[PDB]
Design a protein around this ligand. Structure first.
Ligand code: HEM
Ligand code: HEM
Ligand code: HEM
Ligand code: HEM
Ligand code: A1IER
Ligand code: A1IER
Ligand code: A1IER
Ligand code: A1IER
Lengths: 340, 344, 340, 344
């Protein structure tokens, strides 16, 4: 009813227990260490809440403009929360390595790997278990409800899977209707044929050859999308994650983004990329903080494996919407884009 | 002693209770409303923790260079936390006024005035109870709990950061009349500097330019009378224009004059961070009023008029600025050539 | 053709002239003072360029969804540029007051009042000359092309005037069509009548009276918008700037913002408010910097009039879209809003 | 000497020439493209100015506390400018790929490689020419102008901030074998500390726990061999893992151990700011590659394949990090109780 009761500050503000204080040798910065983590976990709970609601709205045959606006609003909110979480790292960096050394021994069985909510965010966004650098990540959890939650987050459709189903059903790709993919192939042939005819008229012979070489590079780019087998091979080696039809829809969305009907679906894709990039930015800032606190290896780490694992999470293997970042590779000028 | 147990996530993550969900009409954004406030309250607890530790270090006769560096580190930490809290406002602003309307009726007896930690931060920094804008109810009357009232009473009576910083400034080495005797040398430097300015102003060819400089030199003399005449300083303190004791103000001025000197650089950084904290609390106040206005306007159903909004706008005044004196110290500055040279 | 030539760095990077260096007594921070101002002026030129293009798109009878998206994009860009300009103040604050004192004497005839581009931004956004705290601001400019530019920025329709014409023509306000204003008045009567009937059933008599008192406060709020004469009086005393019909359109936009047809026009209004608030935030950060460099008064200022003028620019007199900030005062719950 | 004349806005504001406008097909966003780059180049000139002044202060036998404070102030200023430059990327990202396509063809001979000031910042900070990733053309070959080539050559041969910081670290008071003799005391402290760790590990009841601790103590001994055996340090320097001389590394380690001490706090802040600058240049590199990829993908018409994109991705490696050694100093830290006590 009143402020403190509505926010349950009785419970919230009685969850801070400094172990160095319990051992009668308090380290002032352990309080900051606890509060920073607790602020991360409150926001992880909010991100999970937003993600689950967006997954429910995406797990439907009909995705109208009203629901699309609501998804864009909540993805944008997650982007703001992730920027705030990236800014929480310089606050914990204000703790000196020597002060952290005076209480890190009490952490002992605790590990960053034991954050159930961080794993739930990764899985709900779409981090594939097979693409993780590897004890299996889920083995760290001994609690049955924690194991159940992890297992459910892996088997339930992730934002990656749901966004792909939505992209596959993009109105415009329909061969009976607008038939975008076929028109796009013809536009590429017409555009590239004109580029070859224009390259021949070049005065300097070195400039004529550079353009003919460049046009061949373009043809190889278009073979990677117009030949389903070349796309499938790229998917197999981890270079792509999207189904061939989801990729077609994402490309069409980027081509018509200035059109009122395609502007919000394009904003939805942009925010997915921003979320992906912000998670990587948190990963990078976290490794820099780990290195400034305890170096690449310290007493208690048993070598540099922990640090090296953290550095390997910065690879494109942990990027969920990897395909979205490369879509501008397939773009042709406005004059060559098939008219709506 | 695993991650979840060490951080007591059993307790921390079971403190979210949506009242709209309890009334069988859940509003999705109520969860954001609760989480945002809980993140503010966790950081308020950290700011209180840092403030209390800084107050203990300042409540001592001996404030060495090692303790000064530690105070500067923790004040800088509070600055970073306050910038983060200012950035939490745009997150809550993603909630639309219509969605907030569907759960604000459950808030009913709850009020932002009931945040004990926010009041504790204000009092521990140094907001005087007499300088608060009041339309009816005293700020402490909002708390019915005896331990909350006791905490508020203790934060008012215990020395604030404002009081403790003043005692530290009064004991500034350099002000000692037996030693460096800064205040007297400063007065002589002002006379020598201003007398030279008058002699230079007389040589001006244009009469309009000669008069502007003589008028400006008189403005300077009035500025220096406000600090060299203790009675003029005392009157400014009485009308709320100043908060510092005359000797604390002398110390603060001396610190700004010699900030480039190794011995005065950390004490100047300590003062700069107090100003930054003051300024950041005002920035949070401004962003909060903008958000309040965009959510419920200047008045809405349930507010009984515009007094809440008008009260929030009045907290943006210099009445709520704690280290008000620090912001105006450059008014008393003279050029490097005129500053009394340090011996050692 | 090459990088330096395309960006005219020959010209751009030969515009830095330290007067303290010319007088054989260089002050290192004068370089920062010049560069900071020059970076402000480059971005002021960009803001003016964006504003003029938005004014051209708004000065048309037909404002379609395609043009609305483009205006929202460029207003958002101006918001990002203004946040960057606010962040340039802490960079100049790194210069100590004593170092600024060693070169401020060379500034002499130069004044912040002589920034033609800052005045052009204020006028193009919509700062009324009559609402300025006052030598007239335009008297500071002796150059004929500068005076012409200022005069043109005052007489040409500002973003404030153009946004109002666009709001007046809002489809939905048409008495022949949707007729929003009349339906809104009826909804307010029905909603408030129900609030009175519900207030009577209250168990505590003190709670019943608070609600009846609150309902009367609501009726006085609605009289300020449903009685054109009360709106006109508020406009006369500077409390409002919008025409009665522009205000009706802005209110309707906020009520239906979740609807696909009203989402971009609402984003346009939100960005106008963000721009207004960011200009005020720059004004506040600028006065704080002025005070930390030269106090409320210093040698050369002839008293505190300069500082006091800067503090008076922080008032609602300099806020252009003042009306937009108070629109939530008129809101009724979703169930009471007239259905589209 | 009015505002516009003092800032030479006649010159500054007549440097914007849209090539799409010259070809009678203007693209509105080309103006943003030019202005953004011109704002970067103004700030690059400021960073170069600050760097050159810091290099002059560091190129001296006597580096007093007054000059150290001034270096810390200007390095902090460069940090703020770099954070602002990182924030200029989202502004240019508001330009759509299709609009950039309508004017990118006019850019033709222009290249980001032709920014002389960006190369000057890299070289003055300390990026070694041998550590650069090269696919064909040397980075300096991109410049046809003799004065540009001369500037690049001078920035490579003149002592960089990396070289100057190392000379300053070598002369660290405390390393002197006649005086405090830190390095030898540190080696003894490591032996005493590790020997006690071995004796404590033997008392463990569980055999698996006793072995983990003995394995960990061996990892520590290998870490200390990498710094106490000059040949192991020299091999790491040869393979690019380290850049510092063995004595510069000793000084940097000593500074981190005593950072809480008044005499070591500003030298530690100097090192922290060098790391922050290094890190912020990498953050700009990352944001720039993301923007390049969102505008023109990994390859587009006119790029002749993906070599440009692939080169930009390779600049994110530790090969381009100048003060690489500073980031790993906490690997050598021992607890406070084991750190050799300072005499004076
Ligand atoms: C004093 C600062 C910190 C240090 C020294 C540190 C250190 C580490 C280390 C060494 C690991 C790998 C596991 C291990 O070997 O123990 C790790 C993982 C992790 N940490 Fe931190 N950490 C710090 C702060 C934080 C903060 C503030 C958070 C936020 C919740 C966090 C979240 C995580 C997460 C979620 C992982 C797993 C990352 C992944 O699997 O990709 N850490 N950390
Ligand atoms: C939906 C957003 C919010 C609205 C509409 C809102 C509204 C208000 C109102 C109207 C008051 C005055 C008391 C009253 O008349 O009820 C107030 C005071 C206050 N609010 Fe908020 N608030 C919001 C978010 C927040 C957040 C996120 C915090 C952070 C903890 C907060 C902290 C406070 C505090 C501490 C006060 C007292 C300020 C002072 O006395 O100077 N509010 N708020
Ligand atoms: C060392 C820092 C600065 C100081 C001490 C300073 C001081 C002042 C003063 C005293 C005035 C009032 C006119 C006068 O009495 O001379 C003023 C006005 C102004 N300054 Fe600054 N200023 C500083 C930096 C800046 C910067 C970085 C900009 C950005 C372009 C700027 C833009 C302006 C503008 C546009 C005005 C007019 C504002 C208005 O009319 O509302 N100033 N400044
Ligand atoms: C529309 C946005 C931009 C695109 C598409 C873009 C693209 C590129 C590409 C492709 C290269 C490699 C050279 C080439 O193959 O042509 C490059 C290099 C470079 N660009 Fe950009 N750029 C953009 C914006 C910027 C901005 C705003 C700056 C700031 C001054 C900048 C600075 C540089 C620099 C200095 C390099 C060399 C980097 C290094 O050698 O590590 N670029 N850019
Ligand atoms: O993984 C652990 C951990 C353990 N050490 C550690 C390092 C050196 C010597 C002793 C101990 N650092 N980190 C960990 C625990 C907790 Cl409670 C939180 C956390 C967030 N990231 C990681 N974390
Ligand atoms: O002061 C209250 C409050 C009550 N209304 C409100 C407004 C309009 C119609 C109904 C209700 N808004 N705010 C308040 C409660 C809580 Cl729980 C938190 C809070 C943080 N700032 C303020 N807060
Ligand atoms: O208005 C002037 C000014 C003049 N003084 C000043 C103050 C004290 C003693 C001597 C001189 N400060 N500011 C001014 C010039 C320039 Cl070039 C730029 C500027 C941006 N804001 C303002 N500015
Ligand atoms: O390197 C060039 C460049 C050329 N293209 C480009 C890409 C695709 C098709 C046509 C052209 N993009 N970038 C470049 C020029 C300029 Cl003026 C500035 C710049 C800052 N980074 C890089 N830049």
């Amino acid at each position: 009813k009143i402020y403190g009761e509505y926010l349950m500050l009785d419970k919230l503000l009685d969850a801070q227990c400094m172990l160095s204080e319990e051992d009668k040798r308090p380290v002032h910065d352990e309080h900051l260490f606890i509060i920073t983590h607790q602020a991360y976990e409150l926001w992880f709970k909010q991100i999970i809440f937003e993600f689950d609601s967006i997954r429910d709205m995406l797990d439907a045959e009909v995705i109208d403009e009203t629901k699309t606006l609501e998804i864009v609003k909540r993805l944008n909110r997650v982007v703001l929360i992730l920027k705030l979480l990236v800014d929480q790292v310089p606050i914990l960096e204000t703790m000196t390595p020597l002060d952290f050394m005076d209480f890190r021994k009490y952490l002992a069985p605790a590990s960053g790997f034991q954050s159930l909510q961080f794993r739930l965010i990764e899985n709900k966004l779409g981090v594939l278990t097979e693409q993780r650098v590897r004890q299996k990540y889920s083995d760290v959890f001994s609690d049955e409800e924690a194991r159940n939650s992890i297992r459910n987050s892996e088997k339930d459709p992730s934002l990656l899977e749901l966004v792909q189903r939505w992209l596959e059903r993009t109105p415009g790709l329909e061969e009976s209707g607008f038939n975008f993919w076929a028109k796009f192939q013809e536009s590429v042939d017409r555009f590239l044929e004109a580029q070859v005819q224009s390259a021949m008229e070049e005065p300097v012979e070195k400039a004529k050859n550079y353009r003919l070489m460049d046009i061949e590079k373009r043809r190889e780019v278009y073979r990677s999308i117009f030949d389903p087998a070349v796309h499938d091979a790229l998917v197999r080696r981890g270079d792509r994650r999207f189904s061939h039809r989801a990729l077609q829809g994402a490309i069409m969305i980027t081509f018509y983004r200035d059109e009122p009907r395609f502007s919000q679906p394009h904003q939805l894709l942009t925010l997915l990329m921003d979320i992906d990039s912000l998670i990587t930015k948190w990963r990078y800032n976290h490794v820099i903080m780990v290195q400034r606190m305890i170096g690449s290896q310290q007493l208690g780490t048993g070598g540099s494996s922990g640090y090296q694992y953290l550095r390997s999470t910065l690879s494109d293997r942990y990027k969920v919407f990897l395909d979205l970042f490369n879509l501008s590779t397939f773009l042709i000028p406005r004059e060559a884009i098939p008219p709506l």
